[PDB]
RNA sequence: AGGGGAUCGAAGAUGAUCAGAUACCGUCGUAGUCUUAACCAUAAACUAUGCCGACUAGGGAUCGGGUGGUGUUUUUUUAAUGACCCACUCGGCACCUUACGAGAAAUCAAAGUCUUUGGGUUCUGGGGGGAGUAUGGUCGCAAGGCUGAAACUUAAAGGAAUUG
């Protein structure tokens, strides 16, 4: 949200649901941001180094949080099978 | 008074003004 | 406001049933709004069962109960029978015991 | 009726919480402990209190009591934990359903076998 | 009976978006629905859509992102007098710096901004933002 | 649910939907060649019928109609398509 | 002395989080009012309204006092707090606090044309509470705040220079009106416009980066 | 982006089938689940144990990704989880909650049960619903042991198992722990059936 | 979708309907029926000059106890008889 | 206007009750209640919720129809039937649970998809009384139905929920 001359104006460009791309606003105290850790050879789990996702309070209320995550992590590489895109 | 009795009240009242007016036709 | 979704009592897809006469006051009341008890009981009673068997021909006989459907009128249902009156919530419960 | 007020019962809790070592099954000494460790304004209330911190003490020795947890118990249990020497791969093979086995066949490999069926 | 086949295809979209979905199937499609669908896509408010061909009137599968708050239809196709395009965008768009009135002119189904640049006007279909 | 392939639905969950609610709609009736070896020729019957279909030359009955699929008669034989 | 009892509280006092925009970014639940006191000290209290309410009891009539308070700077941060105690100053102490907790951001904007510093709104927004709906509309500069004296002060403290308003319903009930105007400017930062379509990497949480420098003992 | 050896071993499958973790629910069957796998006739559905193990891994991945391993709470008011969870928390960072939850533990600093974690493991979202509801007032991701009839409202990543009873719960909890340790961890290498008995995590007697 | 017609040719029905319903306006009806000119002691004009018939002592409604000094007036352009209050302390002493 | 007229029973008459008791309760019982041929056109005629069309969320029952199964049961010699069990699917009467959403609330799968306000169409309401009254027209054998004002008066009347 720039201004007259290129300068950045208006604080705070909010997070978004990785699932719906809706804005995750402040009073949305039901939203969630999962940190999934990257792992290296021989199972070591590398502290402070995550593949991360964010889900809106909406999606979680609707119970879609598990399925939505399933897709997301898997077509990113953390799952193998589980989720199907057909029904 | 009960509405239905008041509806009956004016039914009577009406039938009377129906009479009086008829004396004059 | 509206006090019940069954309104008075239980009729959805009909518009007219047919009055039964109340067993206790003779009041007419729709059949589906009736409040109904199957009063079954032995023709004898409590203590008479021994005296009955004993002063009889036959080995223990058989014994027959009396089967009587009962149709109360709401006010009659409340004044005695099944009624209490229940809280806003407990009202919703259709379970018998 | 001799049901104790809250002030008493509450004081027993708080005491047993932070002075379980010291204290005893005995009232008389539990009595005297109170004078040292805590401030009370009447002889009566102190007795009142101690006779109940005594009572509470007396059946803690025979298993825990809700409300009171002086950490020593939660660790006493955590060591006390252990069991087993059997498990539940003996003997022979795993008995599966038709479809369980198909679940096996359609993902993995090695598995002992055993069929079933069942009805309505 | 269906009066505006457009109205259904718009509504259906909005509902999916609101329910947080990513795709709608709509029925039964028309030339008009497609072109309206096409404008929305030109500006990002949906992704890819696809015409499946029943030997009937058609179905459409739309794939939507999430940048869509509303896509509505204007029920009578009111005539608009190029001077009064202003008044419309005002009544029913969120701000003057984005969002579109999309309408039907003699020179194609176009969003009001294109309509202005080309200098044509006409009747008014719905809108997007 | 929330995200899925409307365009490539699975054959089973497609097979179980209503005949007008599949992706593109089509019938799930079928035709067969039917024969009772008294003769040497086969007649073609619709899986559903309404008319009690008689064979080529012989007054015979082949099937009686029902509320849907015709019941083929007594001892016969058939092959779809 | 402070002594926080919050992962978030400790981190703030510990000078590890400098601005609320951070908190709003990760949508952190605030519980300790002193958070928004060190985090935003330019605030000013406003007692919007005070009404007597009363209750009947098995031995008494509890007439206590309800007070509505709005706090904010005049620079994009509001908070509306409603509390009822039986002393008036008591109701005003607590209300200010509650209103500090409720402190939220405003997305302000230009009526149209870039120029220098957002003076209005980014979109129209509606807020409803009870029967009242308050509808906020972008307006050219020097339009002012077109609103009734209560809502105008709320928009002012919230830091909006020019906006239009329309209201609907029994607006005479101040409690619902401000709560709806409060919802309305709150809604501005959940409105997705094309300038916010750009994907962002998803920032990392203060609760994890200063994991150590938070935490109980 | 896949480990390589973290495939589902034959001994684990054996492990799981013996515990009946794959034995689903009956007529009941929440629509929100493709974790299913063919209806075993007369009631029971069979649970895709691969996707079980595979969720479990993700669970573990997420769990041992909390900087301080203790604000990883394991709830279970279900007795069948109480013994298990206490054990889980023992072996890993994890603070435990067995027995009664007590409401106002995530909201309300004033409470003495007060936690403020970064993640919740939980065993029956029906029985332990207070925790799931509470956390969603305050931004806490929720890993959860679910079944074929469990409410997936506000639980991300469901470990699809069998809270019908017995060992399954314990089995999973053990496996959970057993994996969170094999990660940046105080453990080992390849197969390694692990020292600790799986029957340690179990509901006791009578 | 409830109510009114929407269509592009339904202008007439839309005007008629309004016409029909405007009648429930208390002020509109008074205007169009010419109630003013017809009822109402004045013509419909702002003031009216009349002649004093008797001085009244109207007793006030509850919850007020008083005697409101008034006058019976016969409007000149009219013959219409009307009663009117005489405002302020005394003033009835001025009329006759 | 005929027939019928067992029953229960406006009216009437009576026994009691009561300060009174034109009633409630008890008795007698006219009309009526039933039927034919004509009238009448109103009911809290109610779900106090117009109709057609789309979309939006879960669950177990049930009525009708249909499809599927090396299902159960009927014995004869196995079938064929029939009733039953499981899955699915149209269309019904409803209930359960949630609520994204709606509401002033009670509540509501519509009373949702509405100030981010437009799918098509019908009808009615515009503070309370005055009053469904007056008047005219029209229908009716009548009782009455439909249509249906004003003068004047008045600051409330009303809804839902809360505490007493
Ligand atoms: Mg005469
Ligand atoms: Mg009421
Ligand atoms: Mg009542
Ligand atoms: Mg009826
Ligand atoms: Mg005021
Ligand atoms: Mg009128
Ligand atoms: Mg006079
Ligand atoms: Mg003249
Ligand atoms: Mg008779
Ligand atoms: Mg009499
Ligand atoms: Mg008498
Ligand atoms: Mg009499
Ligand atoms: Mg009527
Ligand atoms: Mg009704
Ligand atoms: Mg349903
Ligand atoms: Mg069959
Ligand atoms: Mg007054
Ligand atoms: Mg009450
Ligand atoms: Zn009765
Ligand atoms: Zn033949």
């Amino acid at each position: 949200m720039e201004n007259d001359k290129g300068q950045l104006v208006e604080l705070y460009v909010p997070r978004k649901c990785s699932a719906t791309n809706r804005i995750i606003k402040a009073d949305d105290h039901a939203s969630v941001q999962i940190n999934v850790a990257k792992v290296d050879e021989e199972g070591r789990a590398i502290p402070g180094e995550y593949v991360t996702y964010a889900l809106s309070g909406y999606v979680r209320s609707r119970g879609e949080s598990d399925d939505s995550l399933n897709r997301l992590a898997q077509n990113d590489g953390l799952l193998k099978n589980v989720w199907s895109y057909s029904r | 008074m009960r509405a239905k009795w008041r509806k009956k009240r004016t039914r009577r009242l009406k039938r009377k003004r129906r009479k009086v007016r008829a004396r004059s036709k | 406001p509206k006090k019940r979704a069954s309104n008075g009592r239980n009729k959805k897809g009909r518009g007219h049933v047919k009055p039964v006469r109340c067993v206790n006051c003779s009041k007419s009341i729709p059949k589906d709004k009736a409040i109904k008890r199957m009063a079954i009981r032995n023709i004898v009673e409590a203590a008479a069962v021994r005296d009955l068997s004993e002063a009889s021909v036959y080995p223990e006989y058989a014994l027959p109960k009396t089967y009587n459907k009962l149709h109360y009128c709401v006010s009659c249902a409340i004044h005695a029978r099944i009624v209490r009156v229940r809280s806003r919530e407990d009202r919703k419960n259709r379970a018998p015991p | 009726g001799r049901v104790r007020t809250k002030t008493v019962k509450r004081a027993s809790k708080a005491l047993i919480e932070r002075y379980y070592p010291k204290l005893t099954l005995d009232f008389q000494t539990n009595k005297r402990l109170c004078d040292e460790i805590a401030t009370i304004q009447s002889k009566r209330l102190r007795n009142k209190i101690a006779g109940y911190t005594t009572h509470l003490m007396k059946r803690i020795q025979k298993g825990p009591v809700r409300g009171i947890s002086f950490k020593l118990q939660e660790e006493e249990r955590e060591r006390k934990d252990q069991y087993v020497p059997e498990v539940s791969r003996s003997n022979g093979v795993l008995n599966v359903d038709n479809q369980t086995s198909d679940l096996v066949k359609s993902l993995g490999l090695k598995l002992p076998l055993s069929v079933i069926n069942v009805s309505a | 009976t269906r009066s505006s086949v457009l109205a259904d295809a718009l509504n259906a979209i909005n509902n999916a978006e609101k329910t947080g979905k990513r795709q709608v199937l709509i029925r039964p499609s028309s030339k008009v629905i497609i072109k309206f669908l096409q404008v929305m896509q030109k500006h990002g408010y949906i992704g890819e859509f696809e015409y499946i061909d029943d030997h009937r009137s058609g179905k459409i599968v739309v794939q939507l992102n999430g940048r869509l708050n509303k896509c509505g239809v204007i029920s009578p196709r009111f005539n608009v007098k190029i001077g009064d395009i202003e008044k419309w965008t005002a009544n029913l768009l969120p701000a003057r710096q984005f969002g579109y009135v999309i309408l039907t002119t003699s020179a194609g189904i176009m969003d009001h901004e294109e309509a202005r640049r080309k200098h044509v006007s006409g009747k008014i279909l719905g809108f997007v933002y | 649910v929330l995200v899925q392939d409307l365009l490539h639905p699975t054959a089973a969950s497609e097979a179980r939907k209503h005949k007008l609610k599949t992706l593109v709609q089509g019938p799930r009736s079928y035709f067969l060649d039917v024969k009772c070896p008294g003769c040497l020729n086969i007649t073609t019957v619709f899986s559903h019928a309404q008319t009690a279909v008689t064979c080529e030359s012989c007054s015979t009955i082949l099937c009686t109609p029902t509320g849907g699929k015709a019941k083929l008669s007594e001892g016969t034989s058939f092959r779809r398509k | 002395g402070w002594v926080p009892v919050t992962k978030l509280g400790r981190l703030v006092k510990a000078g590890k989080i400098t601005t609320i925009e951070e908190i709003f970014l990760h949508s952190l639940p605030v519980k300790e009012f002193q958070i928004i006191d060190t985090l935003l000290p330019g605030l000013q209290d406003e007692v919007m309204n005070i009404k007597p309410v009363q209750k009947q009891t098995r031995a008494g009539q509890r007439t206590r006092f309800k007070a509505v308070v709005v706090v904010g700077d005049s620079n994009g941060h509001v908070g509306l707090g409603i509390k009822t105690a039986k002393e008036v100053a008591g109701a005003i102490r607590a209300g200010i606090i509650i209103a500090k907790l409720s402190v939220i951001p405003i997305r302000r904007g230009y009526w149209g044309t870039n120029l220098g510093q957002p003076h209005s709104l980014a979109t129209k927004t509606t807020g409803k509470c009870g029967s009242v709906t308050v509808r906020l509309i972008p307006a050219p500069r020097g339009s002012g705040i077109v609103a009734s004296p209560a809502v105008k002060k709320l928009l002012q403290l919230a830091g909006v220079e020019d906006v239009y308003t329309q209201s609907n319903g029994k607006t005479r009930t101040l409690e619902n009106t401000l709560k709806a105007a409060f919802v309305a400017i709150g809604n501005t930062y959940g409105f997705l416009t094309p300038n916010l379509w750009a994907e962002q990497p998803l920032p990392v949480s203060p609760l994890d980066i200063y994991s150590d420098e938070a935490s109980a003992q | 982006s896949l480990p390589a050896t973290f495939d589902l071993t034959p001994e684990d499958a054996q492990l799981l089938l013996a515990a009946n973790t794959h034995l689903g629910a009956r007529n009941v069957q929440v629509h929100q689940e493709p974790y299913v796998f063919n209806a075993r006739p007369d009631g029971v559905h069979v649970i895709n144990v691969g996707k079980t193990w595979e969720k479990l891994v993700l669970a573990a991945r997420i769990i041992a990704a909390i900087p301080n391993p203790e604000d990883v709470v394991a709830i279970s008011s279900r007795t069948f989880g109480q013994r298990a969870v206490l054990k889980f928390a023992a072996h890993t960072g994890a603070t435990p909650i067995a027995g009664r939850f007590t409401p106002g533990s995530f909201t309300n600093y004033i409470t003495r049960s007060f936690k403020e974690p970064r993640l919740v493991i939980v065993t029956d979202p029906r029985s332990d619903a207070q925790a799931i509801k509470e956390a969603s007032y305050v931004n806490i991701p929720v890993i959860a042991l679910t079944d074929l009839d469990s409410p997936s409202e506000f639980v991300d990543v469901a470990i699809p198992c069998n809270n019908r009873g017995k060992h399954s719960i314990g089995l999973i909890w053990y496996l959970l722990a057993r994996e969170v340790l094999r990660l940046r961890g105080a453990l080992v290498d390849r197969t390694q059936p692990w020292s600790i008995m799986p029957d340690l995590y179990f509901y006791r007697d009578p | 979708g409830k109510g009114k017609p929407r269509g592009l040719n339904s202008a007439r029905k839309l005007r008629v309907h309004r016409r029909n319903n405007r009648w429930a306006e208390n002020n509109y009806k008074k205007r169009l029926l010419g109630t003013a000119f017809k009822s109402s002691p004045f013509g419909g004009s702002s003031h009216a000059k009349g002649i004093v018939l008797e001085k009244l002592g109207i007793e006030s409604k509850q919850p007020n106890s008083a005697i409101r000094k008034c006058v019976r007036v016969q409007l000149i352009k009219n013959g219409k008889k009307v009663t009117a209050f005489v405002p302020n302390d005394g003033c009835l002493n001025f009329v006759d």
Side-chain angles (χ1 to χ4, degrees), chain A, chain B, chain C, chain D residues 1-88 92 95 98-109 112-113 120, chain E, chain F, chain G, chain H residues 3-188 193-202 206, chain I:
Chain A
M1 33 213 177
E2 299 144 339
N3 77 340
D4 195 61
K5 48 187 71 51
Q7 263 237 132
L8 194 265
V9 97
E10 197 52 26
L11 31 81
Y12 169 47
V13 165
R15 293 183 288 147
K16 276 174 275 185
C17 199
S18 347
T20 72
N21 300 117
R22 299 152 95 146
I23 292 190
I24 310 195
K25 49 193 302 160
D27 68 332
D28 186 344
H29 290 302
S31 41
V32 138
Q33 180 163 347
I34 324 263
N35 285 312
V36 189
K38 309 241 211 52
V39 284
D40 62 32
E41 350 304 291
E42 206 122 322
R44 268 163 35 235
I46 313 185
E49 207 69 31
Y50 320 91
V51 171
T52 129
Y53 301 112
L55 321 176
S56 77
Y58 180 80
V59 188
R60 285 177 34 91
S61 88
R62 257 297 205 69
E64 297 292 318
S65 174
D66 176 47
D67 185 89
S68 271
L69 216 202
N70 281 18
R71 190 230 326 163
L72 285 195
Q74 164 169 142
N75 52 25
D76 222 334
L78 330 191
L79 287 180
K80 198 266 220 88
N81 304 331
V82 166
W83 193 76
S84 287
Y85 178 49
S86 283
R87 292 295 194 68
Chain B
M1 73 184 303
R2 160 119 86 131
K4 112 142 62 187
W5 300 152
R6 175 130 135 82
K7 186 216 200 75
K8 175 199 274 283
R9 210 225 245 339
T10 91
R11 248 74 173 283
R12 310 230 197 83
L13 186 287
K14 245 185 300 194
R15 154 170 57 212
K16 222 148 207 312
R17 323 217 272 211
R18 204 174 305 150
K19 248 76 212 246
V20 227
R21 233 185 140 202
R23 313 183 110 247
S24 180
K25 304 200 318 180
Chain C
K2 209 171 193 296
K3 170 156 169 189
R4 286 165 266 225
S6 68
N7 282 8
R9 218 170 149 81
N10 212 329
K11 140 213 158 289
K12 281 200 183 219
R14 235 167 319 273
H16 187 272
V17 285
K18 178 141 293 184
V20 290
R21 311 301 312 274
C22 180
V23 59
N24 186 269
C25 64
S26 315
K27 184 186 203 77
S28 157
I29 159 195
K31 194 243 181 57
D32 72 291
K33 186 195 226 256
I35 228 219
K36 299 179 204 72
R37 260 52 181 172
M38 261 287 181
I40 55 262
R41 275 182 285 102
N42 295 293
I43 38 86
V44 270
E45 58 202 355
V49 58
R50 187 198 190 269
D51 290 279
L52 189 274
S53 75
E54 186 105 49
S56 307
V57 42
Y58 310 140
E60 100 127 275
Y61 177 46
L63 217 284
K65 303 119 69 189
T66 310
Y67 315 79
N68 187 16
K69 232 221 201 311
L70 269 299
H71 297 247
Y72 289 107
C73 85
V74 170
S75 303
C76 292
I78 287 153
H79 190 56
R81 226 77 246 200
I82 258 268
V83 35
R84 273 359 98 125
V85 160
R86 299 133 91 201
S87 100
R88 178 68 170 172
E89 237 78 294
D90 311 43
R91 274 204 276 257
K92 296 174 168 179
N93 183 258
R94 310 192 116 219
Chain D
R2 207 74 77 95
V3 171
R4 269 72 79 180
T5 168
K6 56 208 181 211
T7 53
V8 165
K9 295 198 210 279
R10 200 200 319 285
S12 307
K13 187 200 200 281
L15 279 182
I16 291 203
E17 271 169 0
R18 48 198 74 175
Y19 285 95
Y20 186 97
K22 299 174 132 63
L23 282 175
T24 20
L25 275 238
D26 172 39
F27 160 74
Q28 284 303 317
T29 162
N30 276 16
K31 166 172 91 200
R32 283 278 144 85
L33 221 207
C34 286
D35 311 69
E36 305 290 315
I37 175 266
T39 9
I40 291 172
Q41 323 293 340
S42 80
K43 202 207 310 303
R44 217 179 105 142
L45 215 215
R46 184 251 286 123
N47 300 317
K48 236 61 140 61
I49 293 183
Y52 196 72
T53 92
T54 296
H55 184 55
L56 295 201
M57 279 279 160
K58 203 164 165 74
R59 65 183 257 262
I60 284 188
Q61 240 87 332
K62 306 302 292 196
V65 184
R66 209 193 79 116
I68 39 262
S69 58
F70 40 89
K71 199 196 308 101
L72 178 136
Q73 319 162 326
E74 195 192 355
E75 251 103 357
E76 265 202 40
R77 247 94 130 83
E78 269 303 326
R79 291 194 313 178
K80 188 190 300 170
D81 279 330
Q82 219 90 157
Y83 206 1
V84 185
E86 165 182 349
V87 98
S88 302
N95 305 276
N98 256 24
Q99 9 286 340
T100 302
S101 69
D102 299 333
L103 172 52
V104 185
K105 195 146 45 174
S106 299
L107 70 86
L109 201 249
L113 332 87
Chain E
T1 57
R2 306 170 171 275
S3 320
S4 181
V5 121
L6 212 204
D8 296 310
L10 283 181
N11 177 265
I13 284 188
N14 274 94
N15 272 274
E17 263 277 330
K18 277 157 175 176
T19 41
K21 243 90 72 172
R22 234 93 219 293
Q23 4 65 219
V24 206
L25 163 130
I26 95 194
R27 189 176 75 104
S29 157
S30 82
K31 297 196 316 193
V32 189
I33 294 182
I34 299 295
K35 290 209 142 287
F36 198 119
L37 279 177
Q38 278 179 332
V39 188
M40 290 194 268
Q41 141 180 99
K42 181 156 75 178
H43 292 313
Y45 291 85
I46 53 162
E48 153 169 332
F49 58 98
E50 188 158 349
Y51 177 80
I52 120 152
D53 169 68
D54 43 16
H55 267 167
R56 278 75 186 175
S57 305
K59 307 208 182 177
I60 308 177
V61 161
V62 182
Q63 301 284 320
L64 45 288
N65 38 47
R67 358 179 169 286
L68 185 44
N69 334 78
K70 191 144 173 193
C71 55
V73 59
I74 298 296
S75 137
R77 312 242 180 105
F78 293 95
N79 309 305
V80 179
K81 233 196 174 57
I82 216 203
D84 299 327
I85 51 101
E86 279 93 331
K87 298 222 201 169
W88 273 106
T89 65
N91 294 9
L92 81 209
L93 289 179
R96 347 175 74 257
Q97 31 265 338
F98 69 100
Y100 297 104
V101 165
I102 166 272
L103 78 215
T104 340
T105 69
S106 69
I109 292 209
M110 56 186 175
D111 69 276
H112 76 274
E113 212 165 285
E114 171 174 3
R116 203 93 196 115
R117 299 192 249 96
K118 309 227 319 168
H119 210 63
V120 205
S121 189
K123 300 200 168 36
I124 163 184
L125 316 157
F127 57 94
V128 244
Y129 52 79
Chain F
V1 39
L2 239 262
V3 62
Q4 65 171 325
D5 212 338
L6 295 171
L7 266 173
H8 305 91
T10 84
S13 76
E14 193 80 330
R16 48 139 89 199
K17 302 188 95 52
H18 189 284
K19 142 264 282 280
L20 298 166
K21 293 199 161 188
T22 54
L23 185 57
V24 175
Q25 43 132 327
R28 340 285 243 328
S29 35
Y30 57 95
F31 296 71
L32 14 66
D33 324 333
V34 187
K35 46 171 181 178
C36 59
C39 295
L40 314 174
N41 257 75
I42 59 193
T43 84
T44 300
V45 188
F46 190 64
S47 49
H48 304 54
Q50 306 169 11
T51 73
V53 182
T54 54
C55 224
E56 176 79 352
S57 58
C58 63
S59 331
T60 182
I61 226 171
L62 283 183
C63 67
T64 79
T66 77
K69 283 186 164 171
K71 147 93 68 197
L72 299 93
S73 289
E74 191 228 352
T76 48
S77 67
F78 47 86
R79 158 198 278 263
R80 200 168 305 217
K81 311 153 61 181
Chain G
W2 184 351
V3 184
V5 53
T6 3
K7 285 192 169 67
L8 197 270
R10 249 168 283 103
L11 285 187
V12 169
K13 154 171 280 308
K16 297 306 169 173
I17 305 194
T18 316
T19 61
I20 340 196
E21 329 294 313
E22 266 253 274
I23 298 188
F24 296 136
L25 212 221
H26 302 69
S27 301
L28 299 178
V30 173
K31 247 121 225 299
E32 289 210 313
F33 70 92
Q34 301 96 328
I35 268 131
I36 84 118
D37 275 317
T38 46
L39 226 59
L40 187 43
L43 251 47
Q44 320 104 41
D45 56 79
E46 195 50 35
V47 38
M48 286 316 206
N49 168 87
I50 305 182
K51 70 191 297 185
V53 295
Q54 14 203 40
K55 149 176 195 185
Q56 254 49 217
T57 212
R58 257 256 330 185
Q61 169 164 6
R62 257 77 254 205
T63 146
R64 32 230 224 280
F65 296 79
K66 205 191 202 176
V68 166
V69 160
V70 152
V71 303
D73 37 17
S74 290
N75 199 48
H77 304 106
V78 237
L80 174 277
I82 292 176
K83 163 71 168 194
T84 130
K86 31 189 189 180
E87 294 189 317
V88 155
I92 302 203
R93 274 184 235 93
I96 288 186
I97 281 175
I98 274 188
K100 296 232 192 79
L101 285 335
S102 62
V103 161
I104 220 202
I106 281 196
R107 166 112 142 117
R108 32 254 248 271
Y110 300 105
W111 169 83
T113 235
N114 254 331
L115 243 283
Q117 300 320 102
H119 68 107
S120 197
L121 271 51
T123 65
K124 326 184 198 119
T125 60
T126 287
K128 179 189 181 72
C129 170
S131 86
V132 191
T133 104
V134 185
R135 184 191 187 206
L136 310 187
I137 293 214
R141 225 188 272 86
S143 308
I145 305 170
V146 179
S148 49
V151 176
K152 182 186 226 104
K153 202 73 146 69
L154 167 77
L155 289 174
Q156 256 158 344
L157 294 190
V160 186
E161 307 197 5
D162 310 278
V163 63
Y164 293 136
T165 55
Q166 296 196 280
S167 41
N168 212 342
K170 194 186 275 317
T171 57
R172 268 192 291 158
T173 125
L174 242 163
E175 227 225 337
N176 285 343
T177 297
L178 297 186
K179 291 173 74 153
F182 180 71
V183 166
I185 31 90
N187 293 341
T188 53
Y189 242 141
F191 206 114
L192 219 175
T193 113
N195 68 340
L196 260 54
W197 286 354
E199 176 177 311
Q200 287 286 7
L202 262 204
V204 219
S205 177
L207 297 335
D208 292 325
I209 263 60
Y210 305 108
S211 176
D212 340 36
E213 353 222 8
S215 285
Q217 307 102 282
Chain H
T5 341
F6 275 177
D7 293 353
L8 199 260
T9 77
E11 68 225 34
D12 296 332
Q14 293 185 14
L15 262 159
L16 290 152
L17 308 173
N20 304 345
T21 70
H22 69 288
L23 275 75
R26 205 153 247 78
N27 185 322
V28 80
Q29 241 295 345
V30 167
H31 178 28
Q32 314 259 17
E33 322 246 312
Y35 302 117
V36 227
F37 188 87
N38 270 345
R40 182 260 282 288
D42 329 322
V44 202
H45 293 83
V46 213
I47 306 184
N48 237 129
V49 222
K51 341 220 303 181
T52 301
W53 160 256
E54 218 174 308
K55 275 303 216 72
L56 203 144
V57 172
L58 191 66
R61 262 232 198 81
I62 298 165
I63 287 155
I66 310 297
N68 278 129
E70 74 292 356
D71 24 72
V72 174
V73 196
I75 334 286
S76 195
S77 64
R78 287 277 305 278
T79 46
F80 284 87
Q82 279 174 243
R83 210 283 179 83
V85 293
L86 244 34
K87 254 45 251 289
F88 174 93
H91 300 188
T92 85
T95 137
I97 300 180
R100 158 141 225 258
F101 181 63
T102 279
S105 281
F106 297 164
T107 93
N108 206 354
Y109 35 98
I110 243 47
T111 218
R112 307 178 187 190
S113 198
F114 201 47
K115 326 282 182 182
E116 203 165 32
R118 304 225 89 268
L119 192 53
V120 174
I121 335 265
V122 68
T123 84
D124 192 326
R126 189 184 299 269
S127 289
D128 288 304
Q130 260 298 335
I132 309 201
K133 169 184 140 94
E134 265 241 54
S136 51
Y137 276 78
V138 82
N139 285 77
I140 291 176
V142 183
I143 290 179
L145 279 202
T146 58
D147 205 310
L148 286 184
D149 55 16
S150 314
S152 20
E153 342 290 299
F154 297 116
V155 335
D156 345 81
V157 49
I159 300 200
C161 58
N162 179 256
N163 55 26
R164 289 296 148 262
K166 257 190 147 55
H167 323 257
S168 301
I169 319 118
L171 208 222
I172 303 298
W173 273 104
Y174 162 90
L175 297 179
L176 237 228
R178 188 255 273 181
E179 202 58 42
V180 313
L181 285 168
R182 300 167 92 116
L183 299 158
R184 205 264 165 173
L187 244 297
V188 71
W194 193 27
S195 356
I196 271 73
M197 251 284 151
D199 295 35
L200 181 69
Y201 296 64
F202 264 176
Chain I
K2 181 183 68 63
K4 53 180 94 177
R6 237 74 178 288
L8 228 244
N9 300 356
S10 71
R12 166 175 297 126
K13 172 130 165 188
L14 289 174
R15 338 144 53 180
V16 174
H17 213 99
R18 183 86 304 110
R19 264 223 298 286
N20 289 339
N21 278 269
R22 261 294 247 345
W23 284 107
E25 251 116 311
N26 178 40
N27 0 39
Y28 172 88
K29 190 155 187 162
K30 299 298 133 37
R31 228 169 63 234
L32 256 162
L33 302 185
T35 299
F37 305 144
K38 295 208 219 125
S39 338
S40 87
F42 296 3
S45 44
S46 51
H47 299 62
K49 212 208 258 175
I51 287 183
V52 193
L53 299 178
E54 64 185 318
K55 296 139 80 79
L56 298 189
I58 317 305
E59 85 177 359
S60 66
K61 294 139 130 192
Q62 300 299 297
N64 282 350
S65 180
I67 282 179
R68 302 277 114 118
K69 312 309 178 283
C70 299
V71 285
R72 278 246 108 192
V73 189
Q74 207 192 349
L75 299 173
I76 296 200
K77 40 128 179 240
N78 235 1
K80 291 222 162 91
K81 262 111 80 100
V82 133
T83 125
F85 178 53
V86 203
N88 299 300
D89 196 13
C91 286
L92 191 77
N93 303 313
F94 297 131
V95 297
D96 299 21

